[PDB]
Amino acid sequence: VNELERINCIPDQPPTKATCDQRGCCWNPQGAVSVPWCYYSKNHSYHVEGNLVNTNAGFTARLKNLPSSPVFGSNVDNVLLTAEYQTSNRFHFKLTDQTNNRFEVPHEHVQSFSGNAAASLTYQVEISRQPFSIKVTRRSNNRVLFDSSIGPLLFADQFLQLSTRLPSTNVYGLGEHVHQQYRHDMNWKTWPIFNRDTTPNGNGTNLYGAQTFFLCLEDASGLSFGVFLMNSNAMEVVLQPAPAITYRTIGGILDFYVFLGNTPEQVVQEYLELIGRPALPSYWALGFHLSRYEYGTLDNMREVVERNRAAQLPYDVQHADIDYMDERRDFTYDSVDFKGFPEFVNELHNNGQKLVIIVDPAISNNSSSSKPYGPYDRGSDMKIWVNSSDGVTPLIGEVWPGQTVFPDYTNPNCAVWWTKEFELFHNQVEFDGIWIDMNEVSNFVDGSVSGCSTNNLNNPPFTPRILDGYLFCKTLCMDAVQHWGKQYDIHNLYGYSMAVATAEAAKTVFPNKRSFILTRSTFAGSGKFAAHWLGDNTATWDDLRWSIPGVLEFNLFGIPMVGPDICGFALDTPEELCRRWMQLGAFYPFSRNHNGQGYKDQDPASFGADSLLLNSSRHYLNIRYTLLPYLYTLFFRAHSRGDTVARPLLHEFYEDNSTWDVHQQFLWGPGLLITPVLDEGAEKVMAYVPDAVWYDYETGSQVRWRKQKVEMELPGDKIGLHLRGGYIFPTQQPNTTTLASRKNPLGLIIALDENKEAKGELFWDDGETKDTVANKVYLLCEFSVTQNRLEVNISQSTYKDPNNLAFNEIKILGTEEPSNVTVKHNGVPSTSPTVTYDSNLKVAIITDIDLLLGEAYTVEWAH
Numbered sequence: 001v002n003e004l005e006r007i008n009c010i011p012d013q014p015p016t017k018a019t020c021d022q023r024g025c026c027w028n029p030q031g032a033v034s035v036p037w038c039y040y041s042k043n044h045s046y047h048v049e050g051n052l053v054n055t056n057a058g059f060t061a062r063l064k065n066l067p068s069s070p071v072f073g074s075n076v077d078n079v080l081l082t083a084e085y086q087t088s089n090r091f092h093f094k095l096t097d098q099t100n101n102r103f104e105v106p107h108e109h110v111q112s113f114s115g116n117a118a119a120s121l122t123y124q125v126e127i128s129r130q131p132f133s134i135k136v137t138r139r140s141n142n143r144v145l146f147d148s149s150i151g152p153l154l155f156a157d158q159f160l161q162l163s164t165r166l167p168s169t170n171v172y173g174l175g176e177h178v179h180q181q182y183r184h185d186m187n188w189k190t191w192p193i194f195n196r197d198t199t200p201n202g203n204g205t206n207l208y209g210a211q212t213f214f215l216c217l218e219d220a221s222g223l224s225f226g227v228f229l230m231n232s233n234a235m236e237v238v239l240q241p242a243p244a245i246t247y248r249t250i251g252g253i254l255d256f257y258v259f260l261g262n263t264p265e266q267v268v269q270e271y272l273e274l275i276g277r278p279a280l281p282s283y284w285a286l287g288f289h290l291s292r293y294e295y296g297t298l299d300n301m302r303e304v305v306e307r308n309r310a311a312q313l314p315y316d317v318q319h320a321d322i323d324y325m326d327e328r329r330d331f332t333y334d335s336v337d338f339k340g341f342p343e344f345v346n347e348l349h350n351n352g353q354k355l356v357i358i359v360d361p362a363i364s365n366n367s368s369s370s371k372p373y374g375p376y377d378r379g380s381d382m383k384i385w386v387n388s389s390d391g392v393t394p395l396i397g398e399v400w401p402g403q404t405v406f407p408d409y410t411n412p413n414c415a416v417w418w419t420k421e422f423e424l425f426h427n428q429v430e431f432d433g434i435w436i437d438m439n440e441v442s443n444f445v446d447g448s449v450s451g452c453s454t455n456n457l458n459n460p461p462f463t464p465r466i467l468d469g470y471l472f473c474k475t476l477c478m479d480a481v482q483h484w485g486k487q488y489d490i491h492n493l494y495g496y497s498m499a500v501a502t503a504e505a506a507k508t509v510f511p512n513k514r515s516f517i518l519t520r521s522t523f524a525g526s527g528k529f530a531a532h533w534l535g536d537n538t539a540t541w542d543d544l545r546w547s548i549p550g551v552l553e554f555n556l557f558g559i560p561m562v563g564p565d566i567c568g569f570a571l572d573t574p575e576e577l578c579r580r581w582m583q584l585g586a587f588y589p590f591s592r593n594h595n596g597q598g599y600k601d602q603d604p605a606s607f608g609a610d611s612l613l614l615n616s617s618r619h620y621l622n623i624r625y626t627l628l629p630y631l632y633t634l635f636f637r638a639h640s641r642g643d644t645v646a647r648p649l650l651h652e653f654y655e656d657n658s659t660w661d662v663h664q665q666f667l668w669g670p671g672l673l674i675t676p677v678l679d680e681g682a683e684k685v686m687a688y689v690p691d692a693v694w695y696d697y698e699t700g701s702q703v704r705w706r707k708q709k710v711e712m713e714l715p716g717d718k719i720g721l722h723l724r725g726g727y728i729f730p731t732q733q734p735n736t737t738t739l740a741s742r743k744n745p746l747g748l749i750i751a752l753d754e755n756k757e758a759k760g761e762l763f764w765d766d767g768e769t770k771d772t773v774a775n776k777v778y779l780l781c782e783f784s785v786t787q788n789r790l791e792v793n794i795s796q797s798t799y800k801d802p803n804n805l806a807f808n809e810i811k812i813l814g815t816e817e818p819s820n821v822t823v824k825h826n827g828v829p830s831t832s833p834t835v836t837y838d839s840n841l842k843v844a845i846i847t848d849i850d851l852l853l854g855e856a857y858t859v860e861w862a863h
């Protein structure tokens with residue numbers, strides 16, 4: 001056994017030979033740091049009993065436990081392997097107890113399969129019987145992708161483990177964590193996963209959400225695969241330099257999907273086809289959002305709103321945090337400090353802005369005839385709370401308002417209660433979207449106001465390395481009871497079920513509209529319902545750097561609308577850090593400046609009406625808003641096809657191994673390269689320039705750099721932004737709200753490749769109606785340039801914007817002087833455009849044109 005391939009047999013304590021001998025493992029304390037001293041022998045585990053059986057979907061096998069000493073308790077003697085060839089690119093296998101039903105995740109999107117095995121498989125499955133292992137190989141090159149033979153299968157009631165070899169160390173994903181780097185290096189590292197309210201800091205703890213998906217780029221050809229584990233129990237994932245990854249969970253079943261693609265993007269697409277593609281956002285949610293914990297008063301909030309509006313900051317959304325509430329209780333507002341809240345909502349709406357309100361799941365249980373508290377009274381009438389282990393008494397915990405009960409969102413009746421609370425509240429305060437927080441669920445006491453009984457749920461045989469080392473820390477008792485089952489099994493599904501219920505509420509409160517839901521806690525598939533933010537970060541340079549991998553990973557997880565608290569939630573933000581963070585933050589798919597209680601103001605205009613920070617923030621937000629049609633089209637592709645929005649360089653440039661590690665730059669889709677300064681004091685950044693033609697976004701000048709590391713000069717007022725040759729970017733003149741910007745003239749930026757060609761597309765619908773894609777009420781058009789000619793082609797034509805929108809400007813980068821520009825509509829001229837040319841920069845701008853959105857055109861020129 002190569003020591004890199006040793007699978008640790010003593011995950012639970014300091015290794016000893018006595019424990020090693022008792023567990024029947026191998027002892028060799030002579031390795032390098034972190035190399036396990038005690039590791040599994042070659043026949044710990046299961047063997048296939050008798051023959052495999054073909055089924056319509058695939059095959060089954062019966063696995064029988066080989067005699068072994070019971071470490072983490074009640075072992076499963078007879079295991080059933082069920083394998084389904086679900087599609088040419090997706091394999092599913094699950095290991096269950098042949099004799100007993102066990103907890104299975106009741107996912108809202110994924111359904112059971114009742115097909116026949118797919119034809120033309122891109123993969124092959126090999127089963128070894130003595131001992132059991134499962135291998136999945138890529139058919140084209142026989143690359144072993146999944147191979148459990150490196151380790152045993154362990155399957156006890158509260159301890160399940162399976163390992164797989166990996167074909168490379170280009171491994172991305174898992175969550176929710178602060179990984180600091182984007183590529184997992186595969187050095188010995190254990191990542192615990194158990195939804196927890198905790199600071200995203202440098203400690204690598206489990207955080208708010210649970211995401212078991214990873215993607216592996218196999219080699220420079222782009223061939224990639226992914227693995228998803230459908231299990232909601234506390235678990236950890238162990239990475240080691242074999243390379244290999246081990247999943248170790250403390251309940252449920254091992255239900256695995258393996259996805260193959262020809263590129264990293266195809267793997268994400270296959271994963272999202274399974275778990276659910278992300279919602280198309282309201283176009284206004286793409287704008288800039290501003291927020292803080294504790295304005296304290298409506299007057300204070302108004303003062304902030306007003307100075308940022310006075311500054312002409314692009315600024316669509318204002319969030320109201322728990323300070324709007326009457327004593328931090330949901331579905332109230334403070335009639336003194338927030339007196340006149342409804343009037344302020346009208347002011348926002350009149351200014352073309354939106355209000356997003358925070359709503360917490362925990363509900364104050366303080367109600368009497370003297371002073372009733374409606375949401376509690378109504379929820380109690382409907383009996384929709386999470387109960388204690390007795391199965392009948394609502395569990396009492398403590399959150400913002402004091403003592404609280406917790407809604408059981410797994411109960412469909414709970415969604416009815418919740419919907420009605422929102423309806424009642426929306427009648428008083430006409431908010432536009434909902435920010436659901438503290439939904440891990442977060443509890444200010446451990447378990448309940450009376451703690452947690454000692455039993456195998458609260459105190460299991462094995463505890464993964466979750467923060468604080470007890471499952472019930474800062475959450476509910478594990479033996480609490482909900483419709484879908486015990487908190488031990490469904491804890492990781494709380495925020496997911498809450499997002500589903502809040503989407504259901506939206507159906508009534510915002511009829512036929514998308515609205516906007518922002519959630520803290522997530523499970524696989526949450527992006528179908530909600531955006532995410534990366535939680536309670538801190539105003540440090542490390543937190544700035546750590547945000548980009550967090551954004552990229554959530555795009556892999558199908559939650560493309562993701563971002564951190566720009567400038568940092570905890571602590572007073574230094575001007576220089578906030579200026580850099582706003583520059584980068586103009587390019588997060590979810591762009592929100594948010595701040596914790598009591599800290600110095602960090603809203604952009606608070607730095608001074610003529611400050612470098614405000615000027616730079618306005619500048620780059622104006623660029624963001626200019627590219628909103630491009631961004632919105634990226635979201636359309638994420639929703640319809642499963643593409644990422646914020647995208648690693650390697651997804652586009654996988655042929656170039658210099659991109660495999662890059663985590664300080666990222667792309668919007670295929671075409672826009674973002675290069676922030678991320679180091680204190682720096683007016684430069686060490687940047688990678690991929691193998692493409694690149695143009696400076698502002699000047700349009702072609703950079704000399706190609707496929708090389710560069711020192712990019714970025715003074716205090718700059719972030720790197722370059723456009724990829726071969727791409728056409730739709731734009732729209734910016735305004736301070738998207739309500740207004742959407743009415744503005746459109747533009748095209750055509751970034752020519754080495755062959756003087758480029759292609760692009762534009763999706764356009766009404767920006768807010770639900771089912772616009774499903775019901776085919778949209779415009780989709782395609783742009784292509786191949787010399788001397790731009791074609792605008794209409795592929796879907798079932799929405800016509802009433803605002804007379806047209807492309808009134810075409811900017812061509814990397815071109816020789818165009819002459820005789822002519823515009824044809826369905827073959828007919830047209831009215832001579834104006835052409836301006838910069839021969840030093842090789843940039844042409846065509847103006848005095850009017851190409852109506854949704855009409856086909858050819859624009860031709862000579863040289």
Ligand SMILES: *[C@@H]1O[C@H](CO)[C@@H](O[C@@H]2O[C@H](CO)[C@@H](O)[C@H](O)[C@H]2NC(C)=O)[C@H](O)[C@H]1NC(C)=O
Nearest residue numbers: 382383385386387391392393394408481482483
């Ligand atoms: C939590 O406990 C309540 C009782 O406090 C349970 O309420 C039951 O709800 C159903 C309505 O679906 C009624 O038919 C029963 O009469 C209720 N019981 C009582 C005693 O009122 C509720 O089911 C419990 N929830 C869970 C997840 O077990």
Ligand SMILES: O=S(=O)([O-])O[C@@H]([C@H](O)[C@@H](O)[C@H](O)CO)[C@H](O)C[S@+]1C[C@@H](O)[C@H](O)[C@H]1CO
Nearest residue numbers: 197198199292293321322358437536596597
């Ligand atoms: O620090 S804290 O006092 O602010 O409480 C944190 C958290 O609870 C923290 O204490 C962790 O335990 C690790 O520090 C809580 O998450 C803040 S919530 C989400 C945020 O975005 C809203 O503005 C806040 C008000 O609704």
Ligand SMILES: *[C@@H]1O[C@H](CO)[C@@H](O)[C@H](O)[C@H]1NC(C)=O
Nearest residue numbers: 199200201202203204205542
């Ligand atoms: C780890 O946790 C504690 C927070 O309670 C903190 O003081 C320490 O700085 C953290 N370490 C890092 C690297 O974030």
Ligand SMILES: *[C@@H]1O[C@H](CO)[C@@H](O)[C@H](O)[C@H]1NC(C)=O
Nearest residue numbers: 351352733734735736740744
């Ligand atoms: C920008 O929005 C304002 C509304 O606040 C509107 O009056 C103005 O005309 C818009 N500017 C344009 C057309 O670019």
